[PDB]
Design a protein around this ligand. Structure first.
Ligand SMILES: Nc1ncnc2c1ncn2[C@@H]1O[C@H](COP(=O)(O)OP(=O)(O)O)[C@@H](O)[C@H]1O
Length: 135
């Protein structure tokens, strides 16, 4: 889920672009402390927000993860990524969740939408709002 203070684009950035530490256990604390639960799996794309916004400009395609959606876009270029996997689930205390990290270079498919009119900066009319898939 998404904390109230973030727009979908801001939450996308927090979850898949701003890896605050090259270590998943530490990087995931940010996401988990925000959504009050240890996310089982999360991919951090080693790319820039602007790079992803531009991928939103690639042709529209069906979202592999939600076949009814056509707001997805394929990167057209593989990128380095770190995939975090929960190794130590801790529902009674989320700061004790540990993760494994798996490096890879793959393509990414992102769902994009028009920006949150009120909260998203006007600089980017179109923004990524969901990481639909890594292929
Ligand atoms: N590579 C993956 N394989 C399987 N499940 C995943 C993967 N990445 C994330 N998930 C799971 O999918 C759900 C949504 O996460 P995510 O795919 O990152 O979407 P979003 O960008 O909308 O937050 C979470 O339960 C997460 O643990």
């Amino acid at each position: 889920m998404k904390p109230p203070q973030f727009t979908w684009a801001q939450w996308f950035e927090t979850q898949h672009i701003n890896m605050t530490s090259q270590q998943c256990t530490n990087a995931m604390q940010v996401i988990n402390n925000y959504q009050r639960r240890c996310k089982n799996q999360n991919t951090f794309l080693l790319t820039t927000f602007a790079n992803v916004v531009n991928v939103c400009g690639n042709p529209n395609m069906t979202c592999p993860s939600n076949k009814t959606r056509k707001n997805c876009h394929h990167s057209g270029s593989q990128v380095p990524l770190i995939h975090c996997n929960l190794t130590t689930p801790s529902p009674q205390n989320i700061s004790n969740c540990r993760y494994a990290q798996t490096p890879a270079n793959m393509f990414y498919i992102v769902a994009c939408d028009n920006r949150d009119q009120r909260r998203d900066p006007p600089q980017y009319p179109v923004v990524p709002v969901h990481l639909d898939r890594i292929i």
